[PDB]
Design a protein around this ligand. Structure first.
Ligand SMILES: CC(C)C[C@H](NC(=O)[C@H](Cc1ccccc1)NC(=O)c1cnccn1)B(O)O
Ligand SMILES: CC(C)C[C@H](NC(=O)[C@H](Cc1ccccc1)NC(=O)c1cnccn1)B(O)O
Ligand SMILES: CC(C)C[C@H](NC(=O)[C@H](Cc1ccccc1)NC(=O)c1cnccn1)B(O)O
Ligand SMILES: CC(C)C[C@H](NC(=O)[C@H](Cc1ccccc1)NC(=O)c1cnccn1)B(O)O
Ligand SMILES: CC(C)C[C@H](NC(=O)[C@H](Cc1ccccc1)NC(=O)c1cnccn1)B(O)O
Ligand SMILES: CC(C)C[C@H](NC(=O)[C@H](Cc1ccccc1)NC(=O)c1cnccn1)B(O)O
Ligand SMILES: CC(C)C[C@H](NC(=O)[C@H](Cc1ccccc1)NC(=O)c1cnccn1)B(O)O
Ligand SMILES: CC(C)C[C@H](NC(=O)[C@H](Cc1ccccc1)NC(=O)c1cnccn1)B(O)O
Ligand SMILES: CC(C)C[C@H](NC(=O)[C@H](Cc1ccccc1)NC(=O)c1cnccn1)B(O)O
Lengths: 178, 180, 180, 180, 180, 180, 178, 178, 178
């Protein structure tokens, strides 16, 4: 395909794309792209451009752990939409290299999920939803440099950001003005 | 209609899934028979797989609210909400015919309730409250501790009529009174 | 309505699939006819493919609980739960018309019950208990050993009216009483 | 209702597909009219594509069991089970109006019955028994050998009213009695 | 109900698709009105797209069997089986209101009848017999040769009320009798 | 029922889509009210989007056949077949309330009629005959030439109540007779 | 495809991915990848990165037997999610080479299934569910170095683990902190 | 695709996979792979690894006849699941070369099917179901070295095997313990 | 694809596959394969292995005419299933070169179809069903060397054959016992 070819040629330029809903399929695709680019050169930065409506936490945590444990810096680029998990992976970039394009939008909100099964199953799901929520908020606290109480109050429903608002909140470090 | 003839003899069927339409039918029939005569026993023949917890506690409260004693007899099955409604009868007046099964289990959400984790924390605190309220309801009616109900209803505990009598859900395995 | 006219002559149709709606219809009709006259025989014409085990044992217990004798006559088919309800009639009063088939088989779950293996262990211990209870029910009504019922109902055992008489499910192949 | 007015004149319609709901309607109507008067003829107007074999033999046995003679008249079609029920009338009293068709064929399973080959061997021995029982039923009512019925019902054998009279399924092609 | 009021005035609607449920409704209404008075004319107002051939010949034979004359009046459409039932009225008593259309065509199988070619040879010999029987039925009622009916019903031949009068399907284009 | 009370005051609703079930309801109501009193006016309140051409001409002929004058009043919409039935009222007695719309258009086949081109040539000659018959019907009732109806109904021509009065579909825009 | 190309280039670097629900299709894909990499070099380790919500036991037992009978070590990597069978195959790695990325989540629970058919069929299914449960718990006991009674009590419903909790429980041997 | 490429590279190493439900599509794929490998070298063994839930008898009989009439030995490998037809094709391997991986499961049961059509059609289907059942049991008797009466009694419903139980029953000849 | 590659490599070895229901799509595929192999060498035999549940008569008659008018012999191979049209095309092979693998099953039955439309349409369909049935039975008479009356009586419903029964009936000429 052409669309796979253009992504392949920017993979050669160490530019990868979180360009859809982060499910397990494209997370393992992005994790493999980060591992492949860290195997090629451990020094040159990986540009992760993020046009993402969010998605699975563990799929995004797979990308986040692959971003951190890569020895090269992951420059993240809010391109249009960095919502939910794509917001997270945007703010998960290397400090100083988290970039928002000027009309990208950043959506930070508490994680979505579902409860099902028996009451003992749901109580375990609730305990794990409280663990996922706390780790999503602690890492967003670590990314933005803001307290977890502010992250918890702001993510309680959908909190939208412009590139300038995400700059002052701490998701990104610069706004690209070429 | 044999349903109406038994209703005139103060006999009610919990014979379908316990939902709000079934609960309103039971509560109307319980409150009419209370208004007809509050002293004669209402007989509640229960053949039900259970259902919703709200419609459970709608029937449960109405069974306990009416002045008439509720004779719960289980026929075939009293599962889930219907086992609690079987135990919800008047003490000494809770029966099961000998091959009726009694299924007790913890509450469950049918399907998946989507939502934010703050909404899911409330839905989980509610299904835990529904779990605790069911176990407390089964505690005062079976004579067992609510922690014993919690360990026993952790998964499906199907009782026979004899096993539901020993558990305290019914009071008498109702003997066959056939003349031959 | 010919259903109501036969009901006034104490004749009940088990004519549909034995589910909880059908079971509640039979149990209401059995308990009205018990309350009308507990001495006259209730005739239960059975044309049914069977159905659920709980609704089986709901009808089974109610047939055995009522003071009136239950004349079960099989017409066409008494399959699964309906074969057990056919055998559940009063001894000496269980009939089948000569070209009615009687299908006995072990219980089965319709579709797939999903769940954890601890839940499935309980569902399997229950369907084994449903298997053992059916075979014990068919033991006391056919006069055969429950292990004989287990080997015979391991798969589908379709009996004719004569073969169900020799098996003990009915007591008399009901002769045609046409005057011509 | 013209259905109820004809029922008071002892006239029954087998007018739908012969399933268990239709069979229970016929058997209730046959047993009420037997209990009303066992000496007057029941007229069974048959316009049916047939249906299930159990509901066939449920109606078949009930037609033969009741004390009243069953006048089967075919109107339009008697196919499959309905052709057997047409032949199941009282001898001398089986009619078909002249442009009624009579379709006789061997039994068939609708759709695919899945299962292990031991289960399928039993389902096939049953549909062979259903085939043999239909041919034996059509043997005693048409006067032909059951092996002749087997060769003729190997595929669809549609008879006219005259051809069903020669075959023995009816006894009289019912003449039009219009006064003009 | 205006349907019941017209039925008491011996007026029947063939107003729906001619299937077995519609045919049984017509045949019950024809045989009640024969039993009420066999001398007064039955009026059959026909607004129908036709339907099944068996339910056609069920109504056709019943129209010809009853002692009462059948006044068929077409209103709107008498298509397929309904055109044959329109022609099936008593001669001199077959009407159509002036803007009723009459569609005659050869029989057809709805959808695809699958099967082996030996089964399909029988289904084709049957639909050819249904074709020949329709053309013979339309021959004796329209006064035309059956080969003329075969050439005319080879495809859809929609007649007006005047054209169905010249064809012989009706006898009188029924004039409007409005007083103003 | 306000439908039955207005029917006793000789008031009929054409209030649904004009199909064969609706047409049979109108024709039964028109022929009962003709048989009740052929001299008093039948009022036909029309709120309908139209429908089938056969059910149109079934109602059309019946409106013209009955001895009673038909007062058609349009309420809301008289579209397609319903506009023709609105124009089909007795001259001088065709009304529309002032904000009722009247949609006239040429006939159309709903969906796609498949078939061979010889079959499609007949279906097209029929829908052309249905087009010509509608325009001829609207010619004699609106006073306009059938070629004028053909140019006007080439596409949707929605008229107001005043515009349908000038067109000749109604005779009087029915004034509001409210006392205040 | 590009996603097949990036997985192919890390297959050259002996990095394979349990990146979806382990059904029979990707298990035979992973088993063939383990056989192919053991045929190339029997000494260099295979890195199995696991972003998996679990799946079929016998599909995972196919992977597990292919992991053990490969003469080279299977380094397993909890990447985001190691749940159910993916938890199992994570803990099925070579001892000392079972790794959890720091925000990966590990879900250990008793196997899921279904009962159907006649009571004699279900009784056979139950006996086999008891055999599968015992072998899943004995192998999780062998992996984690903990008793089968603790594995049975903990897997009774969903038991979630962080990377640190899976480290102390015994699913993994280290947490990657590059 | 990568998954077709990894199967192609093990096809070069004479390793083929019964890795799904054996229908006509992958049976003709496996039959063509056995014919192609017997055309390359008639002496080197074909390794058939079987992760299969079973399937069509005639599709498996197509594979079985292609396995026998190949002049080279077909080493069969129970990998996770060898059920029904995949059990059959496992036990259909060359004697001494039928291998079970230690946690593979072997399911032997009488064939499944369906009856439909008229009673004369079903009677022919029943006669052919009795012929298929007898040939499936006679060949399983020939494979396992056990009587057809024991095969018929054991296959009456689902009979499950571990690798050790399939070793003593006769489906496999060794258990791979590398 | 790999499955297209393995069929391509046996197409080089003049081995083609009737491996599915013979519809128009794979008949034109098989007809083109017979034309291509007759264009390469008009002397070497084409091996047609048949694992087919039957199918369209005219699609099979397309294959049958392409088999006969090819100047090279078409060796047919019953592999698992030769039912209906695949039975026909099996028996349509060159005499002496029609082979059944020993556990292949051969199903001969009268053709299946459907009647629809008006009675004049169905009467034409019936006349053509009688022409198709007569030509299917005459050619099966010509293939098996048995009378058309025996073919008509035996094909009236489903008649199943083993490889030995198809040998004595005349569908095949040998049973491969390598
Ligand atoms: C990243 C967080 C904070 C916000 C949203 N992400 C989630 O919460 C996602 C949304 C999602 C995606 C795919 C499948 C199911 C659920 N939730 C989860 O992945 C999830 C939910 N409950 C427990 C564990 N993980 B985002 O996708 O809108
Ligand atoms: C255990 C007893 C008390 C009741 C059982 N189930 C429940 O608790 C029911 C199951 C059910 C039934 C119908 C619709 C949705 C859910 N739970 C509830 O009704 C429920 C409702 N809101 C929140 C949480 N649970 B029974 O129906 O199996
Ligand atoms: C063999 C006799 C006792 C009854 C036969 N089948 C059963 O036992 C029935 C079949 C059935 C019917 C309706 C819905 C679900 C399942 N089994 C049960 O009802 C049942 C219910 N809960 C657990 C296990 N089995 B019969 O219906 O074929
Ligand atoms: C030939 C006469 C006896 C009856 C014909 N068909 C049958 O025999 C019917 C066809 C049918 C109807 C409804 C649902 C399922 C199957 N066969 C059976 O009822 C039947 C039932 N159980 C096993 C085997 N056959 B008729 O309906 O075409
Ligand atoms: C031409 C006259 C006689 C009747 C016309 N159609 C038929 O002949 C009908 C069309 C139809 C209607 C309902 C369901 C199936 C088929 N044909 C039959 O009823 C029919 C039934 N069995 C075999 C062959 N044809 B009419 O309905 O268009
Ligand atoms: C224009 C007037 C006469 C009627 C309008 N439509 C028609 O003419 C109707 C539209 C319709 C309605 C129901 C089902 C199928 C088709 N045409 C017909 O009824 C019709 C029927 N057979 C052949 C050709 N047209 B109206 O319903 O829009
Ligand atoms: C690995 C275990 C402990 C946990 C879960 N795995 C299972 O139990 C899986 C879930 C699954 C996957 C695909 C199809 C059907 C079922 N269960 C099975 O594979 C299974 C169930 N019953 C018998 C044999 N195998 B995991 O997928 O959540
Ligand atoms: C191999 C045998 C012993 C066990 C099972 N196999 C079968 O019996 C298979 C299951 C299946 C697969 C595909 C389509 C239809 C049926 N049955 C058949 O192929 C079959 C059934 N009846 C007649 C001829 N073949 B296995 O798939 O569970
Ligand atoms: C080859 C013959 C003898 C047996 C069977 N073949 C047929 O009869 C096939 C089955 C089929 C396949 C595809 C689409 C429609 C029908 N029938 C035809 O192709 C057919 C049917 N009627 C007229 C012309 N051709 B085989 O497929 O079971």
């Amino acid at each position: 395909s052409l669309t796979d070819s253009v992504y392949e040629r920017l993979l050669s330029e160490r530019i990868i794309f979180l360009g859809s809903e982060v499910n397990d399929e494209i997370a393992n695709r992005l994790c493999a792209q980060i591992l492949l680019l860290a195997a090629e050169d451990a020094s040159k930065d990986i540009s992760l451009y993020i046009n993402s409506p969010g998605g699975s936490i563990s799929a995004g945590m797979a990308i986040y752990d692959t971003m951190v444990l890569a020895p090269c810096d992951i420059a993240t680029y809010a391109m249009g939409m960095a919502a939910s998990m794509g917001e997270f992976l945007l703010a998960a970039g290397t400090k100083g290299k988290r970039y928002a394009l000027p009309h990208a939008r950043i959506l930070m909100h508490q994680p979505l999920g579902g409860v099902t099964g028996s009451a003992a199953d749901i109580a375990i799901q609730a305990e794990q939803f409280a663990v996922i929520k706390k780790e999503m908020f602690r890492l967003n606290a670590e990314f933005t440099g803001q307290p977890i109480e502010r992250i918890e109050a702001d993510s309680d429903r959908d909190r939208w950001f412009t590139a300038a608002e995400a700059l002052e909140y701490g998701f990104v470090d610069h706004i690209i003005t070429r | 209609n044999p349903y109406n003839k038994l209703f005139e003899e103060r006999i009610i069927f919990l014979g379908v899934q316990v939902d709000d339409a079934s609960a309103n039918d039971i509560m109307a029939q319980l409150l009419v028979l209370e208004s007809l005569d509050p002293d004669r026993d209402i007989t509640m023949y229960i053949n039900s797989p259970g259902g919703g917890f709200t419609s459970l506690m709608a029937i449960y409260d109405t069974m306990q609210y009416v002045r008439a004693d509720i004779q719960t007899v289980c026929l075939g099955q009293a599962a889930s909400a219907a086992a609690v409604l079987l135990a919800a009868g008047t003490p000494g007046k809770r029966m099961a015919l000998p091959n009726a099964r009694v299924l007790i289990h913890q509450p469950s959400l049918s399907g998946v309730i989507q939502g934010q984790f703050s909404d899911l924390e409330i839905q989980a605190a509610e299904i835990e409250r529904m779990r605790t309220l069911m176990e407390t309801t089964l505690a005062r009616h079976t004579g067992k501790d609510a922690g014993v109900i919690r360990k026993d209803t952790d998964r499906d505990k199907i009782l026979t009529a004899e096993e539901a009598k020993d558990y305290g859900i019914i009071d008498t395995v109702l003997e066959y009174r056939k003349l031959s």
